[PDB]
Design a protein around this ligand. Structure first.
Ligand SMILES: NC(=O)c1ccc[n+]([C@@H]2O[C@H](COP(=O)([O-])OP(=O)(O)OC[C@H]3O[C@@H](n4cnc5c(N)ncnc54)[C@H](OP(=O)(O)O)[C@@H]3O)[C@@H](O)[C@H]2O)c1
Ligand SMILES: NC(=O)c1ccc[n+]([C@@H]2O[C@H](COP(=O)([O-])OP(=O)(O)OC[C@H]3O[C@@H](n4cnc5c(N)ncnc54)[C@H](OP(=O)(O)O)[C@@H]3O)[C@@H](O)[C@H]2O)c1
Lengths: 333, 330
């Protein structure tokens, strides 16, 4: 009978990002939640995700609106039989602690989820980033064993999966990340070679040294100048999966010099962009089951860069874009 | 009577746009033929955009590279008797001594009504580039909207006409009103002058409101960057050339947006004519021949008379003075 008020906190974009995002660009907001109506559910954020795409997608956002994003939530109260109280769900509810949903965009967590795996993996390795890697590598690059794969942002959420899936499929893998720590971690999880792109004497020589015969596929997470240099190291008919271009997210208006036509043409390279969401239904579930299975078998190792506290979400996003994160950046409620 | 051959050599590596001073004429009396050799006399010499890039590899003083239609004057090789017409990668020279190894004979049933110089264009390398770039790389099946840059050029003109005969909608871009009028007359559904149009995006949008299935890229650079936003989802981009940056290869303009390539999930693919060989290549040439004879593929040659005017013809073509294939008559 007693009714208790639910305070929902949200992170809103105060001012659009000029260059690198700063704390001042965000403003905490609090809103009192109305009671649930028939066919509605009240969600309580457990784990929130911060992702690179937010830096770009934030532009289409109206200043004052809530930042976009996916989160793992728990159903506190329910008046929707499909989502019973206590059930776990994935929601594109944005940066908010609590949220009322009619059940539309809600996605039930993979059934048979092991207690030993933290639920936050549903936002990374056994989630969107892991699916991005799975498809961009196996579908776009289309590796079938033996190929040499280069992956930028190798110690990131997507890159970490790419490299390990490439290894379990019999490919030689070269990874590039931003710290000596990430490089050491890459060697530990199975990368054949890895170098710190920030301290390299010569990017061309490093890539050459890592694979003198070149690369069959380059999973591009960085774009920009790094991409331009890689082209010269690609084998004839080599594929380039354009997954992201994080190096230019803060300078989309003033993009750096482009890729050389000479390399693209004479080496007859194939460059292809893609988005995770292209793969739906049965193939997507299959991919999730495989990632789950590979994690349990120890094939795909993982690490989460956990930031505790909803109030520290802007910092977690900013630092993730700056490279402080080893593995998936996740913010615990 | 001895033969004195003249050759155009690279005096100095091009700095931006090539000029006349970058070329030097050299004359040398050729030695007698040795067994298995032939003496060639250039008839038609080609000047091509790739020469602007390939010249960088040359050791200053070397003869400029290129293909030419030549006749056998003297012969000591049974495979090539005097009187034969051949295609040779002999470079910019009036006379050349070959051992017969690289010489390619023209299509066996060459029609008299068609000038031999077409063997260097529409029914040649550029024509093959158009054929394979459009049919294999863009891989059109019919009904698609195709965009072609340098539309009134050797490659571009063939792309547009093969696309049309295959049942596609063709949009072409060129740099002169004379070329735009020519493109309309030969079949292009739409054609705009990229130099005068107020907005490149608007011109592309008006030509095809629904977007583009395939973009045959002969220009690259800033032009390419703009096309991307107009490509339909999953659209194909055949990177054939990038003449727009040949004079600034070391100082490349801003690259394509990752946003367009990623969200539209575009496929960009470079290619070189040379990938296609053997029976598939010979069949393509016959198809080109048949289409020209049937009138489906009209052509125009931008002829420059005289060997000493070859540098000028090369420079001109890079600047866009040519409508159709640029060819030099010896
Ligand atoms: N198409 C799709 O469907 C799709 C889906 C998800 C993600 N993506 C893209 O995939 C890429 C990886 O995303 P993620 O979720 O896995 O993030 P993440 O890699 O975990 O985090 C981003 C990482 O990027 C690196 N970075 C930042 N600035 C850089 C710069 N200037 N140059 C080079 N590296 C830089 C940092 O690591 P270092 O210390 O190594 O620099 C940072 O940790 C991003 O570009 C993202 O947009 C695409
Ligand atoms: N991959 C391959 O195998 C292969 C083989 C042959 C040729 N190609 C390439 O195909 C393209 C066309 O070659 P082609 O022999 O047919 O030459 P072409 O088009 O007959 O002559 C080049 C034409 O390019 C245009 N142009 C020059 N500078 C330009 C600029 N800054 N911006 C836009 N257009 C410019 C000019 O026409 P406008 O009046 O329209 O400006 C010029 O007439 C070249 O890029 C060439 O490198 C590739």
């Amino acid at each position: 009978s007693p009714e208790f008020m639910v305070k929902a906190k949200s992170w809103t974009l105060k001012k659009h990002f000029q260059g690198k995002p700063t704390q001042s660009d965000f403003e905490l907001k609090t809103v009192e939640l109305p009671p649930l109506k028939n066919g509605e559910v009240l969600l309580e954020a457990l784990f929130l995700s911060v992702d690179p795409y937010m830096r770009i997608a934030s532009k289409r956002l109206k200043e004052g609106a809530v930042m976009m994003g996916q989160q793992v939530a728990r159903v506190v109260e329910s008046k929707n039989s499909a989502f019973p109280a206590g059930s776990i769900v994935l929601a594109q509810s944005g940066w908010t602690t609590h949220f009322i949903s009619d059940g539309k965009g809600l996605e039930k967590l993979l059934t048979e989820w092991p207690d030993k795996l933290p639920l936050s993996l549903a936002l990374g390795t056994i989630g969107m980033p892991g699916l991005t890697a799975y498809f961009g590598l196996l579908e776009v690059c289309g590796v079938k064993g033996g190929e040499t794969v280069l992956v930028s942002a190798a110690a990131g959420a997507v890159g970490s999966v790419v490299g390990q899936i490439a290894k379990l499929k019999g490919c030689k893998v070269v990874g590039a990340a931003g710290s000596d720590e990430k490089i050491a971690y890459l060697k530990q999880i199975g990368f054949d070679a890895a170098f710190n792109y920030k301290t390299v004497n010569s990017l061309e020589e490093a890539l050459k040294k890592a694979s003198p015969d070149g690369y069959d596929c380059y999973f591009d997470n960085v774009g920009g100048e790094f991409l331009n240099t890689v082209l010269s190291q690609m084998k004839d008919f080599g594929k380039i999966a354009i997954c992201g271009a994080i190096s230019v997210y803060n300078r989309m208006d003033q993009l750096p010099p482009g890729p050389s036509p000479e390399s693209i043409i004479y080496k007859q390279l194939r460059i292809e962009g893609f988005i995770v969401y292209r793969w739906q239904g049965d193939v997507r579930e299959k991919a999730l089951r495989d990632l789950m299975k590979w994690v349990l078998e120890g094939k795909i190792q993982y690490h989460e860069h956990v930031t505790k506290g909803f109030e520290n979400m802007p910092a977690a996003f900013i630092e993730m874009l700056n490279g402080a994160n080893l593995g998936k950046a996740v913010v615990t409620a």
